[PDB]
Structures are given as C-alpha cells and as structure tokens.
Design a binder for this molecule. Structure first.
Ligand SMILES: Nc1nc2c(ncn2[C@@H]2O[C@H](COP(=O)(O)OP(=O)(O)OP(=O)(O)O)[C@@H](O)[C@H]2O)c(=O)[nH]1
Ligand SMILES: Nc1nc2c(ncn2[C@@H]2O[C@H](COP(=O)(O)OP(=O)(O)OP(=O)(O)O)[C@@H](O)[C@H]2O)c(=O)[nH]1
Ligand SMILES: Nc1nc2c(ncn2[C@@H]2O[C@H](COP(=O)(O)OP(=O)(O)OP(=O)(O)O)[C@@H](O)[C@H]2O)c(=O)[nH]1
Ligand SMILES: Nc1nc2c(ncn2[C@@H]2O[C@H](COP(=O)(O)OP(=O)(O)OP(=O)(O)O)[C@@H](O)[C@H]2O)c(=O)[nH]1
Ligand SMILES: Nc1ncnc2c1ncn2[C@@H]1O[C@H](COP(=O)(O)OP(=O)(O)OP(=O)(O)O)[C@@H](O)[C@H]1O
Ligand SMILES: Nc1ncnc2c1ncn2[C@@H]1O[C@H](COP(=O)(O)OP(=O)(O)OP(=O)(O)O)[C@@H](O)[C@H]1O
Ligand SMILES: O=c1[nH]cnc2c1ncn2[C@@H]1O[C@H](COP(=O)(O)O)[C@@H](O)[C@H]1O
Ligand SMILES: O=c1[nH]cnc2c1ncn2[C@@H]1O[C@H](COP(=O)(O)O)[C@@H](O)[C@H]1O
Lengths: 491, 78, 491
C-alpha cells in the first residue's frame, strides 16, 4: 500500500524558477484531523514580541493612525502608526493606542477640590473619560479627597464653572480603595467585588499611586485576542525614517511608550539604515526594531548583523507602489518572502511579508512561504478605522488610499514619485473584517492539514507541504469565471 | 467568522436539458471521432498506452484557438 | 574576425517546446544586398501548379465566389470556390472564372443572321459581352457570315424587337480573319496589326473554329502576375466534400474546367477522404487534389500515400473556428505548419498554411516555417470581391464573415456547430489589397536577407534562418502600445 509523491516542495518551487508571485502557485491539500477554529495563529512579530494573530496594518497615512492601531491590537494583530505627520502628532497617536486599555493607570487625569464641574467637562472633552480622582493638590501623588465620574456631573443643568468639585465628589470616606503593592489580579478582585467602576490604589499615607477602571476588565472579556504589554496596555508600532531628524521623532515615540519601531524605506540595505539600527539599539536597548524593506538574503544579512529584531519583506509589490517602474528594482513577492525567510530563520529573525496582499489566500501563501506575520495596506484601507473620510465618485462609496512615496504624501502631509494616489471601496469595520481574515487563515491551514502557523512553516521547510505552479489559465480557472455578474459577499 | 467559499452570480438562458444534452453528447462523439477513439473506454486506453498525443498551448495558442480577429460574432451552438 | 551564433534554428524552436503560434516567435534579421521589389514570390500550390504569388482565398461562402477567384488569379494567387451551394451554382462560379480571360475562345456565343438585335442585347445581358460572330446556323462549327459587336448595336433605340442581324453585322467580306492551325502568338500578331477588337479563326472551309479578343491582350498587360493555364484561362480551384454526392459535384466542376480540387474537412485523415482522393485520381488523372486539413506528419503520410498533390495545414486556428472548444482537437498553427512541411517536403508535396493569418507578418512567418502557399479567410473577407453586401451596425461599415461549420451555413445556404457567423470591417478591393500583401511579403523577405521564398525555406531548413521566441510582453512590445489612439493606415 503506497502512493507516489505529488507536487513540488518549496525548495523545488523556487529553485528551477523565475520570480513567482502569490498568484503563480497553489498549496496542495493535506489531511484534516482537526476543526478550523482550533488552528493556532500565534505569530512572532520580532525576537521578543508575539501576536495572537499574524496581521499587521501598514504604516501609511491612509491606513494606520490610532483608531486602526487600537482596532488591530484589539483583534490580536498590531498597527504601525505612519510618520507622514509631525513628530508630536505621531507621538500623540502612539499615546492614544497606549492609553486605550490599562492595567494600573499610573498617570490618570487628576483634579483639585478647587476645580469645577466645567473643568471635569473640559477634561472629558480633551481625554474622552469623566472618571477623575480628586486630590488635595490636583496632582497625582497627593492625598486622595474623593472621586468624580460622569454620574456625579451628568444631569447637572448649566452650573458648570459655578460649581466646585468639593460639592460634587463621592467623598474619600465613602470610596472603596486598595493598598499600594496590591497585584493587578488582587486589585481586579477588589474592584470586581466592590461593584464600583473605578478602584483607587493608595499607599499607607492615603495618597493616590494608581487607579484601575472596570471598563478595562470589560475590554478584557470583549477582546480575548488583544495584543498587550506586561502592564496590559495595547501594543503599538510606529514608523521612522533614517534621517538625522528621525532621532527627535524616535525620542518622542519612545517616551509616548511605543513598543516596536519600523524603519521605513524602499530599500533598507543602506549605511543610513544600519546606522539608525545601531543608534536605536545603543540608546533604547529595550526597543524592538523591524528594519529593512528587503528582498534578498544579502540585504537581510546586513540588517541582522546591525541587530534588527525583525525584517520587512517586499520591494515594488504593493497595490499603490511604482518603485519597479521608477527604479527597475525589486523582486516577485512570493520568491522574496521565501528567500529572505529561509535565511532569516537561521538567526531567529521573524519576517513580515509586506504588500501585494489582495486576498486572505495571499495571507495563507505568505505564511506558508515562511513569513511569521503579514502586513496589509490596501486590504485595510477604506475600513471605518482607516484615516480620512468617505466620498462618492462613480456612484461608489470610496476612501482615499495614497502610498507614502506618493508626491501628495510628500507635501509634508526634484522630488520623485514612488506611489500613485488612489481610492478603494468601503470595507466596514476592522472589528468585523479581521475576524473574517482570521477565520479565512484558519480554514486555509485546515485544508492544508496544519494545526498552527508554526507547524505550517515546519511542514514547508521539511518538504511535507507541497505546491503546484499555475499557468495563466490556472489563475483564470482558480478565479471567478464564466458568470455574467457575481456578488462577492465575503462574511 | 462565517467564511464564504463561493460568490453568487447569474448565467444567460440556455433552453432545455432535453435539447442541450444531445448537443453535448454529439460534441463529445465528434471530439472522440477527430481523435480516432470509438468509445470513451478506448479513448482512455489510448491515453494510458501513450497512443493519444497532446500538445501544450502558449497563451497565444489559446487566443488563436478561440474566436479572434472579428468585429462581432454569433455563437449559435445547436 | 568571429561573431557568435545568435537565436534558434527552426529545428531548435519547435524541439524543446509547447506548440507555438505565429505570435510566439520572430525571425531575426539577415543581411540586405537586394531591393525588396526583386524578391521572387513564385510558389508551388500543388506538385504541378505554380503561382506567381503565395496567396490563396479560402473556400468559404463569405470569401470565395467567382469575383474573388478572378481577382485572386489576376493578382497571381488563386481562389478556391466554396461548396456551400448547389453543384450547379458552384460549377457556374468555376465557369465564370475560366471564361474571364481567354486565349482561343473555342466555345464563343454565336448567333444566326436570322437572330435579332434583341437577341444580341439578351446575349449581352446573359454573358456580359456583345462581340458575337454570326454563322448561318447560329452554331459554332458553321460558315462564318459576319461579326456583331456593341458598336454595331450602339444607339439603335427600340429597333431591337425585329431587326435581323444580317443588316447589322460587319459582313464576312469586310472582316479580318486568321487561318486554323495559327498559334496563339501568331493570331495575336494578326489581331494586333489589324487594329480590330476580335479576330475570328477559320479553317480552309471558311467556317468558324475559334475567335480571339483584344481585351484578353489588354488583360495580359494589365495583370502581369496572373495565374493562367496553358490555354491562357485563369486558374480556378473548388472545394468538395467526401460524401457520395460529392462525386456528382466533382463531375460538374471538372466539366466546368476546374484546375484543382480541395477536399474540405476539419480533420482530413479519414477513410472517407482517402477514398475520395483515390476516386478522383482514377476518374480524373489530370486533376490536382489538395487533401487534408492536417496538423501532424502521421495524417500527412496517409494522404500523401493516397496520392494528394498538396496539403492544407491547420486545425482549430482560423478566426471564425471553434473546433478546438467543440472537439478538444487541433494544434498551434506555427508548429503544425513547420511539422507537416518538414515531413511533406521529402515527398515533394507543397503545404498550404490555412487560417489564423491576421497580418502580412503572419504570412512571412508561415512561408518561413515551410508553407509554400498561405490561405486566408478573414483577411480577405469584407473586400469588395467577397460575396454578399455591406451593412452598418456600430456606425461601422461591416460585411458578414461566416465559417462553413457555422449553423447559418449548414441550412443549405443534431447539427454540431464548428464556426460562429460574425462580421468584419470593409477592406476595399483585392486588386489593391493583394499588391499590398505582396509588397509586405517582399519587405519581410528583404529584412530577413532572402531573395525568394525558395531561398527563404532553404535558409530555414539549413539553419541559416534564425528565430527568437517571444514572451507575452514581447508580443505587447511588438504591437502598437503606449498610445491614446492610433490610425493603422496600411497602404
Ligand atoms: N484592570 C485590568 N486588568 C487586566 C487587563 N488585562 C488583563 N487583566 C487582568 O489580568 C488577567 C489576565 O488573564 P487573561 O485575561 O487570561 O490574559 P490577558 O492576555 O491579560 O487578557 P486577554 O486580553 O483577555 O487575554 C485578567 O483576568 C484580568 O484580571 C486590563 O487591561 N486591565
Ligand atoms: N477614567 C480614566 N480612564 C482612563 C484614563 N486613562 C485611560 N483610561 C481608560 O479609559 C477607559 C475609562 O472607561 P470608563 O471607566 O468607562 O470611562 P469613565 O471614566 O467612566 O468616563 P465616562 O465613560 O465618560 O463616564 C478605561 O479603558 C481606562 O483604562 C484616565 O486617566 N482616567
Ligand atoms: N489572346 C490572348 N493572348 C494571350 C493571353 N495570355 C497571353 N497571351 C499571349 O501570349 C503572350 C505571352 O505572354 P507572357 O507575358 O509571356 O506570359 P503569360 O503568362 O502568357 O501572360 P502574362 O499573364 O502577361 O504573364 C502574350 O504577349 C500574348 O501575345 C490571353 O489571355 N489571351
Ligand atoms: N466576345 C466574347 N468574349 C468572350 C467570350 N467568352 C469569354 N469572353 C471574354 O470576355 C472578354 C470580352 O471582352 P470585349 O471584347 O471587351 O467584350 P466585347 O465583345 O467588346 O463586348 P462589349 O464589352 O459588350 O462591347 C474577353 O476577355 C474574352 O475572352 C465569348 O463568347 N465572346
Ligand atoms: N471606588 C469607588 N468607591 C465608591 N464610589 C465610587 C467609586 N468609584 C466610583 N464611585 C462612585 O460611584 C458612582 C458611579 O461611578 P462608576 O465609575 O462606578 O460608574 P460610571 O462609569 O460613572 O457609571 P456609568 O457607566 O453608568 O456612566 C459615582 O457616584 C462615583 O463617584
Ligand atoms: N475582325 C474584324 N474585322 C473587321 N471588322 C471587325 C472585326 N472585329 C470587329 N469588327 C467590327 O469593328 C467595329 C468595332 O468592333 P471592335 O470589336 O473592334 O470594338 P468594340 O469592342 O465593339 O468597340 P468598343 O470597345 O468601343 O465598344 C464593329 O463594327 C465590328 O463589327
Ligand atoms: O509610495 C509608495 N511607494 C512604494 N511602496 C510603498 C509606498 N507606500 C507604501 N508602500 C508599500 O506598500 C505596502 C502596502 O501594499 P498593499 O498592501 O498591497 O496595499 C506598504 O506597507 C509599503 O511597504
Ligand atoms: O466553421 C468552421 N469551422 C472550422 N474551421 C473553419 C470553419 N470555416 C472555415 N474554417 C477554416 O478557417 C480558415 C480561415 O481562417 P481565417 O483566415 O483565420 O479567417 C478556412 O480556410 C478553414 O480552414
């Protein structure tokens, strides 16, 4: 009882070949012994950061500001906030991602009893929340005198500046508290049992040292996949360039609490980028660096030698990109992902496959070819969390989608354009769309017979995972064909 | 979370199966005849023995083998 | 000194390959030592028929009836008259081609002196000419009593009904004549010196044996390339099927004086076709037979063994054709032409490359690959000489272009359609368009460095002629590209 070997290994697929794209090949089906829902999508972003989902939103001005980065992190991916903005704007976007979910809030909004209901309303306007502990100084480290929330100031008619907070607080005698040096789980038990919405943390001197909010425990149960640091804040990435003024931007982003930096370049194998990696790794040794838009092992070597914690793979793929028709330079993305990942895995360096991801099948191909994570631009553009506003043109709801080497982006929003500037049709919310991509990746892995992305890659490197090349007519046959009209209702 | 594996489309009218399947039958018979096969059983035996020969097509052979070079046409099958 | 070898030989181009079309390759340029106008286009149609031009009009109901066949023969090609018509209609189309140019007219229209001016006008209405010798019987072999022409009946208004020809003729006393047994060249000298428009040929008994017309000497100087038989009539081809009733059609076409028969089939390697070739070669040993739409040497063998004088090459190419998507069956035409011609040349059997000829570059490729002649359907459709009438549809002057297995042709104009009943935009006259194709073939051969189609084929078989295979992007680069609009003003 024997059956002959069928299809190519990945090593065979890229050996006797020109550069393949994701469209040029299929994965052959395996054996299914498991449910798609039990497929593990745990992914290394860098040497020290693991995501529950392989998915990254690209650092583009039409893709990733704070709402996208929050939504991606809540879905168990991450967002890298774009750098086509002032350093102060970018750091404020990073701060919004880091403030959205909290363990101990150690720098809350605080007011004095001498402040007013108008000051609580203006605080709610600036920071988005009404739950404000009150201390004698109105600064964080002071003796606690009460707590003010929206239930204390709501349905007061108009006496805003007229009313001092001392008359409006829940006074410190009435408030439930925990001692300093309580663990987060112990503070959560106290808060959960108290049935209150805030729990202040106070030392033996009765002065405020932290506070915790019930809404973060709600965000816990609401978002099981969420990408969080050790102090339970969302993970945030940010882009920086490799110019000297990017050192100032990097300092603002690091004090804003950014977890990972991506060095943003067309061609990352440069003296400028290697110098920036060395500068970061000496000044901020805690900070993860993804360097390198690279497409060859020779480029990957120089950045792994410089000490990057991850690599970005792709050049001239990417929906919006024209680098290949402007510089002659790049690689077919499936070949680039395979070549760079097969090399970078020897050093324990994870790969991000960046650009040309049009479909969830392309995500499964990128992951199968050795990418540990996948970065999307246009596939997440025209979601609700993507920056800017919808418009109508051809009777179609469209959002702008620009590209960062677009000459319109380079107006600080001879110079050479490396991107066009375009539009994409509406997609709805990341919070529904990323669960569709997750379940699509799981069903892809299931048809392949892989229980996780880790076993999927090991099946690929051992040659258990088999591939078939597609003729152009196989790419037609594998697409929608032969119909008059069709309705591509994904999820 | 509820993964679609197909789209939903439309196709133009074809008429009855009781006329269309006799057209497919006769097309299969004419294909086998141009090939020199008296039955689908002998067609498969010619294929496995290597008597049946195939040629690969470039994309331009797929263009040349279709309708080409016309302003418009009328695909009046049966 | 030395220069390295560049490009593939034809043997290499088809060896390590899938089936190529004409679009899939180029011919590499040679050395030019001659003018394009001195490129010899002399072509074998069959073992015994040589044309001055490689060009054939296809036997289709929307391409070749008598006007097309006359025009093709005058341009030094040939037409094959289609068979999707009654045997009597097809033989009458052949008769029109054979009557258009004459050496000795040995079966002229003749009248009695007791016929009338009205009988001469009715004769002119039926046969197209007014020059009618008069014999006392009104039958050919009888005593010459005079000659009547249009200048004799000219401007006789309504005197038609009862004016006997006796008083209208130029009488036999006045007419210039030649003796029987005069050569055509000698009769032409007598006619040319006489300054008359007819010269009757009479025996010593003074009875009519032939006549010659000055208009045939005019047709001589007007058409230097013209394809003529030994008695100076135009060459005509005709199609026939291989059914039993085609034996009757073949008898009508042979007594109408057809020079060459083409056996019309999608797949000519059949017992039915081999039987028809044997039947023709025993019943009509003078008659040239082109058998075989064939695409392999194995098919060609059986018809060359049956005794065909030429082969048609092509299956499922052809603008109008759907045989491949209806029968799975055929071959890429460049490969078919090369394979069959390289085999058939060993037996001295010429090849017609039939169908898929969209451009004069495809003609040069077909001839370079070993075709001795090229047959066109759609490229000659919507010329003025093509059958039927023009119409307008999309604001475009169109003519119908049908195909012979199409389901509109097979209604005597379960049935399986092998063609698609379409339309082609106007091209103007064959008498202008074929000189353009001739000049294009000559400039193709000149860029290649071939002084004739015979040396072109010899350079191909010796491997002196080099080919380069084309990517799809070379086919884009080789076409019109990068323009907003263009005007393809050929000739
Ligand atoms: N106050 C607070 N407590 C948190 C937060 N995140 C987690 N915790 C607490 O720490 C525990 C951690 O266990 P899990 O919930 O299994 O792991 P997690 O990765 O931290 O959170 P999930 O995102 O829900 O998976 C939770 O039960 C909470 O009590 C947060 O943002 N704020
Ligand atoms: N109150 C408060 N919440 C903060 C602060 N910084 C971040 N947050 C987060 O914002 C959220 C507060 O949620 P809630 O407790 O529902 O908000 P609230 O304070 O009651 O204010 P309202 O919803 O406006 O009534 C939690 O996820 C907090 O972690 C801060 O200084 N104070
Ligand atoms: N009456 C007549 N004489 C002809 C005809 N064709 C040729 N001739 C005569 O034969 C001569 C030989 O002509 P050529 O030019 O050598 O060769 P051809 O193929 O016969 O004629 P072309 O068609 O002009 O090439 C001409 O000069 C005429 O005198 C014809 O159709 N009718
Ligand atoms: N006259 C004549 N010409 C014939 C006959 N059969 C074929 N033809 C050809 O038709 C053409 C006759 O041309 P002309 O001599 O110009 O015709 P015509 O006799 O002057 O008559 P009109 O043109 O009507 O004045 C020549 O090419 C002949 O070879 C026939 O029976 N009689
Ligand atoms: N730790 C606490 N101990 C006692 N009272 C508290 C405490 N935290 C908040 N309060 C008081 O409880 C009331 C509700 O505040 P809480 O944070 O629980 O809900 P809220 O977020 O304001 O309610 P809601 O979501 O409906 O707007 C207010 O009067 C507030 O001052
Ligand atoms: N061989 C001949 N000998 C003498 N007269 C002739 C001869 N052939 C024709 N004719 C006469 O010559 C005259 C002109 O006839 P011919 O054939 O030469 O020209 P046509 O074709 O009739 O002239 P056109 O082209 O102008 O219409 C007529 O009267 C005719 O009867
Ligand atoms: O202007 C540009 N030129 C070249 N590459 C760009 C430009 N802007 C963004 N990119 C790349 O394109 C990727 C997104 O590609 P997409 O997912 O196919 O739309 C980004 O993550 C970048 O790597
Ligand atoms: O109905 C048909 N089906 C298949 N082949 C046809 C049919 N009618 C004509 N042909 C072929 O198509 C050739 C003309 O092709 P074309 O020059 O490309 O237009 C003819 O000479 C025939 O060999």
């Amino acid at each position: 009882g024997y059956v002959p070997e069928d299809g190519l290994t990945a090593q065979q697929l890229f050996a006797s070949a020109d550069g393949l794209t994701y469209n040029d090949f299929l994965i052959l089906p395996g054996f299914i012994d498991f449910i798609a829902d039990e497929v593990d999508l745990t992914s290394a972003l860098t040497r020290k950061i693991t995501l529950k989902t392989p998915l990254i939103s690209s650092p583009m001005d039409t893709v990733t500001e704070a709402d996208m980065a929050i939504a991606m992190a809540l879905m168990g991916g991450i967002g890298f906030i774009h750098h086509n903005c002032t350093p102060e704007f970018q750091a404020n976007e990073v701060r919004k991602v880091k403030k959205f979910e909290q363990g101990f809030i150690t720098d809350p909004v605080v007011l004095s009893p001498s402040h007013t209901v108008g000051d609580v309303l203006e605080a709610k306007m600036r920071h988005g929340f009404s739950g404000i502990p009150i201390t004698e100084t109105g600064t964080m480290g002071s003796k606690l005198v009460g707590i003010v929330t929206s239930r204390d100031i709501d349905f007061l008619a108009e006496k805003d500046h007229t009313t001092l907070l001392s008359e409006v607080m829940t006074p410190r005698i009435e408030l439930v508290v925990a001692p300093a040096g309580v663990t987060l789980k112990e503070a959560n038990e106290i808060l959960q049992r108290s049935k209150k919405g805030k729990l202040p943390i106070v030392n033996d001197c009765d002065e405020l040292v932290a506070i915790i909010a019930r809404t973060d425990l709600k965000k816990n149960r609401d978002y099981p996949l969420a990408s969080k640091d050790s102090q339970k804040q969302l993970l945030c990435g940010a882009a920086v360039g490799t110019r000297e003024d990017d050192k100032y931007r990097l300092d603002l982003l690091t004090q804003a609490g950014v977890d990972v930096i991506v060095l943003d370049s067309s061609q990352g194998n440069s003296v400028y980028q290697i110098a920036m990696v060395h500068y970061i790794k000496q000044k901020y040794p805690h900070l993860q660096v993804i360097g390198g838009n690279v497409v060859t092992a020779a480029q990957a070597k120089n950045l792994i030698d410089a000490g990057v914690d991850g690599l970005r793979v792709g050049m001239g793929c990417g929906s919006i990109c024209i680098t290949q028709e402007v510089m002659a330079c790049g690689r077919p993305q499936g070949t680039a992902v395979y070549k760079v990942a097969e090399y970078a895995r020897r050093f324990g360096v994870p790969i991000i496959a960046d650009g040309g991801i049009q479909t969830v099948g392309h995500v499964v191909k990128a992951l199968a070819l050795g990418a540990s994570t996948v970065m999307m631009g246009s596939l997440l553009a025209a979601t609700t969390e993507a920056p800017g506003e919808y418009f109508f043109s051809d009777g179609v709801r469209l959002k702008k989608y620009r590209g960062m080497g677009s000459l319109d982006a380079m107006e600080k929003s001879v110079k050479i354009a490396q991107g066009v500037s375009g539009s994409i049709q509406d997609k709805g919310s990341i919070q529904k769309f990323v669960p569709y991509l997750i379940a699509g990746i799981q069903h892809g892995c299931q048809d392949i017979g892989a229980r996780s992305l880790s076993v999927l890659r090991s099946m690929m490197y051992s040659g258990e995972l088999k591939f078939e090349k597609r003729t152009m007519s196989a790419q037609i046959e594998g697409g929608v064909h032969g119909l008059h009209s069709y309705e591509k209702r994904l999820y």
